[PDB]
Amino acid sequence: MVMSLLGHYNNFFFAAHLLDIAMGVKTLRTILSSVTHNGKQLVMTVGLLAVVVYLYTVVAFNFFRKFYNKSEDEDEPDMKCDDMMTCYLFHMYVGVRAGGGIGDEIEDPAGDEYELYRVVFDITFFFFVIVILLAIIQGLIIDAFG
Amino acid sequence: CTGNQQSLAHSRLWDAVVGFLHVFAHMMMKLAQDSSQIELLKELLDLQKDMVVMLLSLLEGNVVNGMIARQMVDMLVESSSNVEMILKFFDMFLKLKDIVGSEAFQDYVTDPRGLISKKDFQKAMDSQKQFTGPEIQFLLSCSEADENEMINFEEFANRFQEPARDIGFNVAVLLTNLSEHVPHDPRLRNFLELAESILEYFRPYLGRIEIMGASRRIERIYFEISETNRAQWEMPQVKESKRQFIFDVVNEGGEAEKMELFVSFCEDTIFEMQIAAQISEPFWGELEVQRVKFLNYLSRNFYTLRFLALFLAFAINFILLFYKVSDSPPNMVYYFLEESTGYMEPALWCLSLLHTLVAFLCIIGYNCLKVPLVIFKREKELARKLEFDGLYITEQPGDDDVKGQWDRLVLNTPSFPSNYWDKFVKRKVLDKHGDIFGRERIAELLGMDLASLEITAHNERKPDPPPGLLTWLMSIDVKYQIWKFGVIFTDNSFLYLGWYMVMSLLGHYNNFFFAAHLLDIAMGVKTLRTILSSVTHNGKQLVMTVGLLAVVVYLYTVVAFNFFRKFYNKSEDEDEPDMKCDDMMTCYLFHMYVGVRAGGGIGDEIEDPAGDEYELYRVVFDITFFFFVIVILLAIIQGLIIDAFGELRDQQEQVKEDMETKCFICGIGSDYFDTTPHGFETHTLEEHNLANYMFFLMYLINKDETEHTGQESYVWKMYQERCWDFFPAGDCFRKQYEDQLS
Amino acid sequence: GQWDRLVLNTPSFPSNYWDKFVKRKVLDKHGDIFGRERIAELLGMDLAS
Amino acid sequence: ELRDQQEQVKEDMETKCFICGIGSDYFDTTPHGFETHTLEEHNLANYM
Ligand SMILES: Nc1ncnc2c1ncn2[C@@H]1O[C@H](COP(=O)(O)OP(=O)(O)OP(=O)(O)O)[C@@H](O)[C@H]1O
Numbered sequence: 005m006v007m008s009l010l011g012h013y014n015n016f017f018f019a020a021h022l023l024d025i026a027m028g029v030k031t032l033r034t035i036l037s038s039v040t041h042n043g044k045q046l047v048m049t050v051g052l053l054a055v056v057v058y059l060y061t062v063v064a065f066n067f068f069r070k071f072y073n074k075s076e077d078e079d080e081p082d083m084k085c086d087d088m089m090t091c092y093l094f095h096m097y098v099g100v101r102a103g104g105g106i107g108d109e110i111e112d113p114a115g116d117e118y119e120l121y122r123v124v125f126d127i128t129f130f131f132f133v134i135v136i137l138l139a140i141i142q143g144l145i146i147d148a149f150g
Numbered sequence: 151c152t153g154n155q156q157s158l159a160h161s162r163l164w165d166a167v168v169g170f171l172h173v174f175a176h177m178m179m180k181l182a183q184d185s186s187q188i189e190l191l192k193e194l195l196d197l198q199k200d201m202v203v204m205l206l207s208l209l210e211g212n213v214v215n216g217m218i219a220r221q222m223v224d225m226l227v228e229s230s231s232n233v234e235m236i237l238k239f240f241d242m243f244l245k246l247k248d249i250v251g252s253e254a255f256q257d258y259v260t261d262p263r264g265l266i267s268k269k270d271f272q273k274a275m276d277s278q279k280q281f282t283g284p285e286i287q288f289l290l291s292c293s294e295a296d297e298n299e300m301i302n303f304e305e306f307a308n309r310f311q312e313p314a315r316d317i318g319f320n321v322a323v324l325l326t327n328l329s330e331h332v333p334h335d336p337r338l339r340n341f342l343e344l345a346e347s348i349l350e351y352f353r354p355y356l357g358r359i360e361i362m363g364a365s366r367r368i369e370r371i372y373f374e375i376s377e378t379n380r381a382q383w384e385m386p387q388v389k390e391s392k393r394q395f396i397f398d399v400v401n402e403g404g405e406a407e408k409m410e411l412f413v414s415f416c417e418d419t420i421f422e423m424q425i426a427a428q429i430s431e432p433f434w435g436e437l438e439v440q441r442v443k444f445l446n447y448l449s450r451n452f453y454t455l456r457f458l459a460l461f462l463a464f465a466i467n468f469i470l471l472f473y474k475v476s477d478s479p480p481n482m483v484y485y486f487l488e489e490s491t492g493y494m495e496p497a498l499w500c501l502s503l504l505h506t507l508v509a510f511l512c513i514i515g516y517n518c519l520k521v522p523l524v525i526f527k528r529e530k531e532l533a534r535k536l537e538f539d540g541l542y543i544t545e546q547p548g549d550d551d552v553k554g555q556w557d558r559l560v561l562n563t564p565s566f567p568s569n570y571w572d573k574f575v576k577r578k579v580l581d582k583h584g585d586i587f588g589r590e591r592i593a594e595l596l597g598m599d600l601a602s603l604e605i606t607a608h609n610e611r612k613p614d615p616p617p618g619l620l621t622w623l624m625s626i627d628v629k630y631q632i633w634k635f636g637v638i639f640t641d642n643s644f645l646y647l648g649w650y651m652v653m654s655l656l657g658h659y660n661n662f663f664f665a666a667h668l669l670d671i672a673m674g675v676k677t678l679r680t681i682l683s684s685v686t687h688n689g690k691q692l693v694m695t696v697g698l699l700a701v702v703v704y705l706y707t708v709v710a711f712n713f714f715r716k717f718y719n720k721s722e723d724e725d726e727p728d729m730k731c732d733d734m735m736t737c738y739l740f741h742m743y744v745g746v747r748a749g750g751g752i753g754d755e756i757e758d759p760a761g762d763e764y765e766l767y768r769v770v771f772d773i774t775f776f777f778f779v780i781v782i783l784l785a786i787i788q789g790l791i792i793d794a795f796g797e798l799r800d801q802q803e804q805v806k807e808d809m810e811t812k813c814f815i816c817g818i819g820s821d822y823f824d825t826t827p828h829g830f831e832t833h834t835l836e837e838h839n840l841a842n843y844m845f846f847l848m849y850l851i852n853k854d855e856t857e858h859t860g861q862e863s864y865v866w867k868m869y870q871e872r873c874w875d876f877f878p879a880g881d882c883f884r885k886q887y888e889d890q891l892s
Numbered sequence: 893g894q895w896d897r898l899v900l901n902t903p904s905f906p907s908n909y910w911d912k913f914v915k916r917k918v919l920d921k922h923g924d925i926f927g928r929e930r931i932a933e934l935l936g937m938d939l940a941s
Numbered sequence: 942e943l944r945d946q947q948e949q950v951k952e953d954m955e956t957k958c959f960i961c962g963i964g965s966d967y968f969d970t971t972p973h974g975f976e977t978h979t980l981e982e983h984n985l986a987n988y989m
Pocket residue numbers: 809810812813814815830831834835838839840841
């Protein structure tokens with residue numbers, strides 16, 4: 005009702021009524037219930053992802069900050085990890101979406117004293133966050149179906 | 151003694167019991183009149199208890215519809231009137247208690263001092279309607295009413311109930327036993343209906359178990375359970391430990407091992423109850439008792455302290471987010487927070503100090519609460535091995551068992567079983583194996599002076615030492631302390647908490663270290679433990695998968711070095727070329743790093759071979775890389791994780807449904823019991839309740855041996871021997887007497 | 893339970909539930925112990941009626 | 942599939958004798974019955 009009433013104000017609100025298909029159809033109820041069955045576990049997985057990204061962000065701030073220039077132009081440089089919040093948002097957002105990890109989005113450390121530490125940093129990020137955590141999600145969903 | 155039992159049954163004892171019942175009942179009614187006679191009434195109740203014990207001992211060993219039980223039923227029938235009188239006495243006073251506790255009685259009460267008049271008591275009782283008018287008159291006469299005619303209902307109710315408890319429980323036990331062993335005497339039904347209130351009141355306190363008989367036929371035992379013991383059982387942490395034990399035994403517990411493990415779990419429980427009782431809340435000694443109260447409060451609030459520490463870690467990290475770096479002060483850069491308020495920087499310092507304090511208090515609380523249990527278990531198993539295995543006497547450790555090598559030390563230590571209750575393990579082991587291995591060698595191993603042993607036995611010796619801190623220092627055993635500290639270092643949880651401490655301490659050096667404390671959520675939350683345990687379950691397999699990935703990437707790297715090296719220029723500029731695979735190490739790092747992260751594979755990151763003689767070989771190279779490394783190996787990881795979820799889920803389901811289907815004790819299927827309605831439920835709750843078994847065990851520990859029945863002594867002897875044959879396996883009272891039962 | 897506390901006094905109470913005599917049965921059952929008047933006040937029911 | 946194969950093999954081995962195929966329950970009616978039956982009555986090692 006409320007969404008229809010607000011749709012009369014702006015017709016765009018009527019799109020929300022499309023979600024009623026879930027209640028309408030048994031099949032959508034089953035598919036969505038598969039997720040709901042493990043919803044708490046999935047949320048806690050998201051929290052763990054936040055924590056691990058935060059720790060990686062701490063490392064980036066302390067030691068790997070220089071490599072976070074995302075601006076081509078030298079005159080105007082944009083450093084994401086000069087600030088903790090910006091570093092955390094950058095990691096959480098770009099790195100998680102990235103298949104390869106944050107390393108794709110930050111400059112290669114070749115010919116640097118910290119190159120080995122950074123490659124460990126990136127590869128561990130890829131394994132723990134890009135790979136396992138998502139894998140936890142898909143495994144929870146599969147467990148729900150079964 | 152079956153012959154003595156038959157002789158007594160044929161004896162005139164029955165008539166004597168009848169006379170005692172008549173005198174008992176009438177004397178109770180007369181004696182309740184005046185308070186002064188209450189002591190003689192107490193003696194009378196105790197004598198009735200002794201007679202009931204005699205009767206129960208006669209029952210001992212009686213089969214269903216045994217003639218001894220039938221004769222006792224007949225005696226009860228002949229003495230009925232007295233029986234109804236005694237049961238009415240008991241139920242009347244119990245109802246008096248519950249009614250006076252009732253608010254309605256209070257509302258009838260109109261006196262500031264709380265007393266109730268004869269008339270007001272009469273009105274309230276007849277308004278409850280439980281009591282007939284003659285009963286009200288008897289109660290009023292029993293109540294000492296001052297010349298003002300007012301009564302203190304509190305004392306009136308309280309006086310009678312303490313003495314009646316033991317006799318009432320014994321009567322309920324006798325009635326239950328006779329009812330079960332003679333299912334069909336209607337006289338016994340009428341008695342049970344009369345006594346239901348007593349049976350209801352004592353129902354929780356009664357504990358019923360079944361044991362394998364010395365006569366090689368199942369028997370049933372009824373015993374008392376203390377309210378404190380029950381409550382300690384209901385305490386939630388005991389329940390969590392119980393569920394943990396059930397899960398462990400069901401998943402990996404053999405049937406032969408299972409019952410011994412149950413006994414060990416009950417012993418550990420008993421220790422935990424003792425610890426809970428001591429910590430429970432009700433000038434040097436004054437400071438000491440303040441210290442003791444502080445430690446007890448820490449132990450009580452230990453988990454709350456952990457949650458508080460986690461909250462402080464969260465707050466510290468939230469403040470740390472505003473932290474920032476800049477070259478300019480508010481070539482070395484300056485790190486400082488970016489916040490207008492200015493209150494945070496003091497707040498971060500205060501929070502760090504409080505977090506460190508909380509962590510140290512958690513170390514202390516964990517120590518006091520749990521280390522005693524660990525030492526108790528390790529001392530117990532060591533004592534068991536010495537008593538029965540005689541390992542250090544004969545077998546010796548495998549030399550691959552660091553636990554055995556460490557335990558070698560404590561043997562000489564005098565204090566040794568400080569936490570384990572038995573201090574006589576040394577003497578028993580000596581008496582047992584000195585004949586073979588030499589008494590002197592056992593004495594040297596155990597740090598025990600024979601001559602001292604003999605003198606203590608012959609005569610009592612009291613070298614009382616004056617109290618002194620220096621004298622306590624002299625007393626302390628360095629070696630036992632060393633062994634204890636080794637165990638403390640070995641245990642995992644202490645290591646985690648010490649890690650927490652160390653990280654807080656280093657955080658005081660640099661606040662960034664406080665972030666590590668955020669990982670405590672895994673230990674704090676069951677759900678994170680489950681999710682991470684899913685990975686740990688397959689951790690070795692995952693590691694070996696990583697190793698195989700390294701090997702395959704290495705081989706692909708070899709191919710790149712030999713034949714496909716040219717294609718590895720990662721520099722746009724021709725003047726300065728960067729070739730990764732000119733060197734094996736650089737080629738391997740490049741592959742491992744970029745290619746694995748790449749969804750398409752290394753081909754995305756290396757130049758297309760189009761128009762080259764090696765183009766076909768390279769496309770095969772890249773596509774095989776993509777299939778074997780990018781696709782399958784990760785797929786192995788996700789499949790392992792999925793297998794972990796499924797495995798853990800089926801473990802929980804299996805544990806639960808087996809628990810519900812079969813008894814922990816007999817292993818009989820639920821179907822046999824359920825043939826009768828609610829059969830498995832009744833069998834678990836009353837016939838085979840593990841809680842009742844454990845309650846029986848503590849009942850025997852508290853009880854004096856001389857009072858132990860033949861059954862109790864039989865079970866106690868098997869407990870001391872550690873043989874568990876008495877526990878019923880594949881047999882039950884129902885099955886034994888089934889044809890007789892129907 | 894806190895919300896249900898209200899409906900007790902309401903006369904209509906078991907409008908949908910078929911039994912309208914639950915009040916009288918509960919009174920007959922527990923008035924001996926808890927007082928008839930208190931049950932009546934709780935249930936919004938006049939004994940005299 | 943492999944996991945359920947291992948579980949099936951183990952639990953069948955524990956439930957029934959390699960020799961008679963009798964269920965563990967019949968023996969276990971007497972205490973430790975299946976264990977005794979496998980160790981002494983029906984030990985494949987004893988047969989060999
Ligand atoms: N020998 C046994 N003793 C106790 N329970 C047994 C036994 N054999 C099987 N069971 C079953 O195991 C369960 C006992 O554990 P349960 O989880 O019920 O704990 P509880 O304290 O009895 O109850 P709740 O779970 O409600 O707290 C019961 O369902 C019971 O049927």
